[PDB]
Structure 1
Amino acid sequence: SMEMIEKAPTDLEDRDKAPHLLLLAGIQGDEPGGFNATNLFLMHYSVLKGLVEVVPVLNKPSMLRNHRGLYGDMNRKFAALDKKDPEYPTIQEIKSLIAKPNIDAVLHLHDGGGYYRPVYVDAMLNPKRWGNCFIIDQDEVKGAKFPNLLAFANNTIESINAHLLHPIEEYHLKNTRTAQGDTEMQKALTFYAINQKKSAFANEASKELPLASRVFYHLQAIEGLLNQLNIPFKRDFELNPSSVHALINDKSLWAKISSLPKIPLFNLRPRLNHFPLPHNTKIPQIPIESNAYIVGLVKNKQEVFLKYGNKLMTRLSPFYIEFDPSLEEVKMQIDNKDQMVKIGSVVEVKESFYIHAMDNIRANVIGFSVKPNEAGYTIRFKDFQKRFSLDKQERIYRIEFYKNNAFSGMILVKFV
């Protein structure tokens, strides 16, 4: 259930005019620096020549459960692997992407404990820690387009260190010299990549950092490496922790569950009651769209969680029901003007609305009261019990339609 998303030039011919990077994160589901960085890269950057292929989260089931790895460490499955391992097919997908001739370089993002130091200082600062280092398996890979891993790493590190927020965050090189006897790294992603004659790098951001600072350093590493590869790019923001925080916490982010209307990711009430979901559909099979790339649904006890990375956006208390798709649109008066409103849209209301009755369709305006049918009522903001709003701001309300005993669809009204 991982996806690969291309970031490419608008002109297809420009793909071959610069190198190709494979950018990967989220091989651990509890390393949000990485998969929030891949998410922001996908949402807010443009690649002008060459190609950057992105797998924003490698281990999505684990991400959804805020878990390091539900089926064990996925970054130890690139060497020997039982064919019955639940992640065997995923590993083959990842290996396939890595080994494609249209890839030159691989950058794997991680969040890691403490701060790496080449010599022991204390429990947080020592060679066994992983935070804030840029990592190679060896100094060179003969036969790669760009064999000089060490030079690339050193220059990328120099780029990152020109932008430190605090001096303790200084990046260091970590060469694991994997082929020489590092049996753990021999099982990991970048070493597989090396053996396909790809330049391969990993970037670690410290888990001791706030998410926004982790993402900041991940983006510095991505940009540093893109610069070394001479892959030209643009972003639509300034790279600082404040901007990163704002883009993670972006109020324009939405989730579209099934055929329901888009709902905002942020500032939802923490629980949405009697929430219609298609019956007889396993949760991972319920379609969900977003303008972000790390959104999904996951069962928790009797609830369905809406997740944004490791962030819990709301708890759905589901109402499982057949989704009848026959109703495409509903005639509504909005602020005096009659119009046809598509099922699954959000309509802004300044003053009032009125739903026209339909023969075999019942409308329930959630938060408005008199098998309720609430078509034929002129409804204003003052008529709502505000606690039924989707949003903390008390401005967004659900209108649900039923062709009993089936669910005919939903429309949101937003009072503006």
Structure 2
Amino acid sequence: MIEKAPTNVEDRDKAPHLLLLAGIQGDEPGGFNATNLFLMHYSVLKGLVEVVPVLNKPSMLRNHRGLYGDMNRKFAALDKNDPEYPTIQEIKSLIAKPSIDAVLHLHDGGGYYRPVYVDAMLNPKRWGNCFIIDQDEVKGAKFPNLLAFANNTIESINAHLLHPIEEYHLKNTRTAQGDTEMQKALTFYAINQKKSAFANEASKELPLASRVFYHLQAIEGLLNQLNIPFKRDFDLNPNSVHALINDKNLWAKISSLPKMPLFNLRPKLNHFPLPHNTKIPQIPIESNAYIVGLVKNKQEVFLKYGNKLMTRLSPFYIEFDPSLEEVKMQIDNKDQMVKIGSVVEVKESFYIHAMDNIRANVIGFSVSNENKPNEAGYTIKFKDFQKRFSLDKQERIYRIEFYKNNAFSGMILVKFV
């Protein structure tokens, strides 16, 4: 759970409080790319929006809906030995908090919903491009009139239509009065705790940038009805949405290793160091996005950005000695100290100074065939590199690794501008 709040605490009580959820199935990327882009490029000026950007992370990592069955069918009867029993108990705690007024759950669904039959793709049994409620009202809620909030939200979405077929409509499922599937579902538990709950569906038949465009129009619409004010730093059209999701300024950081670009990496990275006696889900990880992770696949380890594969790691396990903090280096004529885990920019040349009990291996450069080398003490230029060992496709980024006895001591990266 991540909060999105005003930079000054005084404003938190000044507007209502929304709970925003997505990723309860791992194969619905419109939903969790939208929660991600909201977290990165928007600001909430009054009130609060709490976000769980992906509820079932093990499944998002395996591009699979469910893994332990459906998570959106486990809010009623549930055996105490079920594997996700602890996780739904926590989600139930989040919904039931006093300070939460409203809930929005984001989905991607098949076809295009219509309130009457038209053909196989367009009918009341489909889920795509609609906005959803359990009941027309909820006696006891702060905002009890579900039906009106929905209709004004839909009006807003339709003023910005790309093409005529994507038009939005309302869908009421009348949950308390018949169908037993929605009785086991998330929003029905939420109205039983007297909260106003909603769902948005975008059609699985659209390219990713269009699905996200509509998930963002829906959020922008609902926040307007609740009077939670906001600001974004970009123009909302499909071309601009495509350019923020595929942004060349995105990064990820594994354990104590340095920051790496997300896009334009090589497909496979070899002899990549990782800590021993530590199961893969326990290895720390960081990014300027909220949907990044690691997952074990036979012998390799995969780096994921939502459902996109960004590179395959071929690892090797070794103790991580934390003793070494910094290293001395010359860059474009000037001597300086550089901390373990940095990135540095070079126009012409660099040089590494030697150390006690520490060994250094510049990956892509070599001076002999001895397989545990020490390449401290050489003046090195761009033309001295074997370009195939670069970390990127543009052939400008290279690794430097440090060792002591049988232990890994740290990494640094160089970038040729």
Tell me the TM-score normalised to structure 1 length.
0.98
Deviation at 1:205, TM superposition (A): 0.7
The CA distance in 1 between the partners of 2:217 and 2:75, in whole Å, is 27
Q: Out of 273, 276, 281, which is 1:279 matched to?
A: 276
Who is 2:295 aligned against? 298
Q: After superposition, what is the alpha-carbon deviation per residue over 1:121-163, rounded to whole angstroms, capped at 9, x for unaligned?
A: 2221121111111000010111110000010111111111111
CA distance in 2, matches of 1:106, 1:51: 12
C-alpha separation in 1, matches of 2:124 and 2:132: 13
Cα distance between partner residues in 1 of 2:207 and 2:324: 46
Residues 16-415 of structure 1: matches in 2 within 5 Å? 16-370=13-367, 371-415=372-416
Instruction: Provide, for residues 333-370 of structure 1, a one-character-per-residue CA deviation record: whole Å limited to 9, x for no partner.
Output: 11111111010011111111111111211111011111
> Which string of whole-angstrom CA distances, capped at 9 and with x for unpartnered residues, describes residues 190-217 of structure 1?
1111111111000001110111111111
1:84 deviates by 1.7
* C-alpha distance in 2 between matches for 1:84 and 1:214: 37
Instruction: Give the C-alpha shift of residue 89 in structure 1.
Output: 1.3
Displacement of 1:93 in angstroms is 1.4
Aligned equivalents of 1:404, 1:213: Cα separation in 2? 54
Query: In structure 2, how many angstroms separate the alpha carbons of the residues matched to 1:236 and 1:82?
Result: 47
Unaligned runs of 5+ in 2: none
Q: Distance in 2 between matches of 1:150 and 1:125?
A: 23
Counterpart-to-counterpart distance in 1, 2:361 and 2:15: 56
Partners of 2:413 and 2:11 lie apart in 1 by: 42
- Structure 2 Cα separation of the partners of residues 54 and 226 of structure 1: 14
Query: Over aligned residue pairs, what C-alpha RMSD do you find?
Result: 0.9
What secondary structure sits across from 2:317 in the alignment? strand
The range that moved more, 74-83 or 130-139, is 74-83
Between the aligned partners of 1:114 and 1:208, the Cα distance in structure 2 is 7
How far does the alpha carbon of each residue in 1:156-201 deviate from its partner, in whole angstroms, 9 at most, with x for none?
Answer: 1111111111111111101001011121111111111111111100
Measured in 2, the distance between the counterparts of 1:163 and 1:78 equals 36
3-state secondary structure, aligned to 2:345: strand
Residues 371-392 of structure 1, C-alpha deviations (whole Å, 9 max, x = no match)? 0111111111111111111111
Shift of 1:404: 2.6
Q: C-alpha separation between the residues in 1 aligned to 2:275 and 2:121?
A: 48
Give a deviation string over 1:32-69, Cα, whole Å, max 9, x none. 00000000000011000000000000111100110111
CA separation in 2, counterparts of 1:128 and 1:104? Answer: 30
Q: Secondary structure at the match of 2:401?
A: strand
CA distance in 2, matches of 1:211, 1:44: 18
Partners of 1:362 and 1:303 in 2: CA distance:
27
Q: Deviations over 1:242-288 (max 9, x none)?
A: 11111111111110100000001111101111111111111111100
Q: What is the rounded CA distance, in whole Å, between the counterparts of 2:339 and 2:23 in structure 1?
A: 37
**Whole-angstrom distance in 2 between the partners of 1:335 and 1:66:** 45
Q: Match of 1:321, SS?
A: strand
CA positional deviation for 1:298: 0.5
Cα separation, 2, equivalents of 1:163 and 1:82:
46
Q: How far apart are the structure 1 equivalents of 2:373 and 2:246?
A: 37
Task: Please report how far the alpha carbon of residue 293 of structure 1 lies from its aligned counterpart in structure 2 after TM superposition.
Answer: 0.1
Alpha-carbon distance in 2 for matches of 1:245, 1:66? 21
CA distance in 1, matches of 2:415, 2:276: 27
CA distance in 1, matches of 2:341, 2:413: 8
Q: Deviations over 1:383-402 (max 9, x none)?
A: 11111111111111000111
Report SS of the residue matched to 1:231. coil
Of stretches 318-327 and 259-268 in structure 1, the one that deviates more from structure 2 is: 318-327
Secondary structure of the residue aligned to 1:322 is strand
Partners in 2 of 1:306 and 1:31 — Cα distance? 19
Q: What is the CA distance between 1:295 and its match in structure 2?
A: 0.2
Q: Give me the whole-angstrom Cα distance separating, in 2, the residues matched to 1:174 and 1:236.
A: 32
TM-score normalized by the length of structure 2:
0.98
Cα distance in structure 1, aligned partners of 2:164 and 2:330: 60
Q: Secondary structure at the match of 1:331?
A: strand
> 3-state SS of the aligned residue for 1:63?
helix
Shift of 1:316: 0.5
Distance in structure 2 (CA, Å) of the matches to 1:204 and 1:107: 11
Distance 2:75 2:238 in 1: 34
Which SS does the other structure have where 1:151 is aligned? helix
Aligned to 1:11: 8
Aligned equivalents of 2:195 and 2:126: distance in 1? 26
